[PDB]
Amino acid sequence: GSSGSSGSAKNAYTKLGTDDNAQLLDIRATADFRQVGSPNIKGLGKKAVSTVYNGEDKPGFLKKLSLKFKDPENTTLYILDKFDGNSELVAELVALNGFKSAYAIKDGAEGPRGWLNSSLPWIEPKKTSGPSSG
């Protein structure tokens, strides 16, 4: 049945605004950071963390969190990938390691109801005037 704590992007932004211990962790690929940009959560009062997840780097990825979060066992790490990718797996990963809890933002940041498609604020990079429809 359900395993990885997940739901809707809006729920995560709401929880991040009432959970003083909540934080957003971008598991996206560095290439996405130049295209889509990065989240904008500071309006509440937190700071994002960027760490490219990879199954080959599970341990090497994990350390980077433990070394930034004072109390991982009390900090909530809301996942953020382009889409599903590994959001639920990584939500259990940190939990099993010792972190408090995590939330896999179903649909990622670019999905049909992702971060952007949820009316949430975001920090896009330097866009250029260039259409792409038809």
Swiss-Prot record:
Chain segments annotated as coiled-coil in the UniProt record: none
Subcellular locations according to the entry: Plastid, Chloroplast envelope; Plastid, Chloroplast thylakoid membrane
Domain Rhodanese: from-to ranges: 18-124
Expression sites by tissue: Expressed in leaves and stems, and at lower levels in flowers and siliques (at protein level).
Phenotype of null mutants: Slight reduction in rosette size, yellowish inflorescences and siliques and small chloroplasts with irregular morphology and no starch grains.
Function: Rhodanese domain-containing protein required for anchoring ferredoxin--NADP reductase to the thylakoid membranes and sustaining efficient linear electron flow (LEF).
Subunit structure and binding partners: Component of high molecular weight thylakoid LFNRs-containing protein complexes containing LIR1, LFNR1, LFNR2, TIC62 and TROL proteins.
UniProt protein name: Rhodanese-like domain-containing protein 4, chloroplastic
Organism: Arabidopsis thaliana
Lineage: Eukaryota, Viridiplantae, Streptophyta, Embryophyta, Tracheophyta
Gene name of this polypeptide: STR4
